[PDB]
Amino acid sequence: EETHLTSLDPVKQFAAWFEEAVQCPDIGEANAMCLATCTRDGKPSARMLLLKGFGKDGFRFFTNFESRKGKELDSNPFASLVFYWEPLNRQVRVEGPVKKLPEEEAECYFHSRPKSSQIGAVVSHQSSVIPDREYLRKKNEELEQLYQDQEVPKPKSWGGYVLYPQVMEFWQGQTNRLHDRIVFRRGLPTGDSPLGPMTHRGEEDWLYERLAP
């Protein structure tokens, strides 16, 4: 077989590549990723985020629901992710529907963060206009005295999302410019509907094929 893969379960293939990036001393945050969202009407936006957990259920991350990305996901729950590991000449793309994580789950995660991080989430109405940087500094100092020795409650607007993967591409750059692209997508006729000459069977309902660079 081999098209240079560890697993035919894309999530398990991601785990192998992720571990390698984590293993690499030249990569600062291997879980740093770019999240692409858009309005229903077709207006895209994108920003860096940190992946906070992954498994069969999907890719998890946290943000403020009232942020610009949050308003977009809530009105049009679809997203794409891009992981780029320059020292490895690798790129991973993930496409799928997104779902809000349960409250208690966000709670547990929220209180596992360092206190200063929790307090930061309470001061900032993420992406709303503010007058200046001093406004943040003042509000932050005041909330630190309010919560001295106290537990910081999670804002109602703060939480997580999990993106269930429908498409996952592994891009491996090559000096000759003929990059390797192996893309997985979930098939509809799973059970046994043999497909195209160039389409292969992956684990579960996953199908994979090579894409020209």
Ligand X SMILES: Cc1ncc(COP(=O)(O)O)c(C=O)c1O
Q: How far apart are CA 68 and CA 90, in angstroms?
A: 29
Which residues 6+ apart lie within 8 Å of 198 measured at CB? Answer: 209, 210
Task: State yes or no: 45 annotated in a binding site.
Answer: no
Spatial distance between the Cα atoms of 57 and 54, rounded to a whole number of angstroms: 7
Q: Which 3 state secondary structure label does DSSP give 169?
A: strand
| 61 near ligand FMN (CB under 6 A) | yes
Strand partners, 64: 158
The least distance separating ligand X from the CB of residue 138, rounded to whole angstroms, comes to 19
Taking the least distance from each CB to ligand X, the nearer of 110 and 206 is 110
Is residue 39 a contact residue for its own copies (CB under 8 A)? yes
Burial class (CB in 10 A: 0-12, 13-18, 19+), 174: exposed
Place of tokens 């890719």: 59
Q: Could you tell me which stretch among 9-17, 38-46, 101-109, 186-194 binds its own copies (CB under 8 A)?
A: 38-46
**Separation between Cα atoms, residue 116 and residue 144, nearest integer Å:** 8
Tokens of 15: 């785990």
From candidates 91, 94, 154, 184, binder to ligand FMN by CB under 6 A: 91
Q: How far is CA 204 from CA 11, 188, 196, in A?
A: 11, 11, 18
Annotation marks residue 186 as catalytic = no
Nearer to ligand X, 40 or 177 (CB): 177
- Segment interacting with its own copies (CB under 8 A) among 8-16, 52-60, 132-140, 150-158: 132-140
Closest CA to 76 of 3, 161, 168, 187: 161
Residue number, 59 or 206, with CB nearest to ligand FMN: 59
The reply on whether position 63 binds ligand FMN by CB under 6 A is yes
Instruction: Tell me the binding residues for FMN.
Output: 47-50, 62-63, 68-69, 91, 126-127, 171, 181
Binding interface with ligand FMN (CB under 6 A): 29, 32, 45, 47-50, 61-63, 67-69, 84, 91, 126-127, 171, 173
* Residues lying near its own copies in the complex (CB under 8 A): 3, 28-29, 32, 34, 36-48, 76, 78-82, 84, 86-87, 91, 93, 95, 116-117, 120, 123-133, 136-137, 140, 176-178, 180, 196-199, 209-213
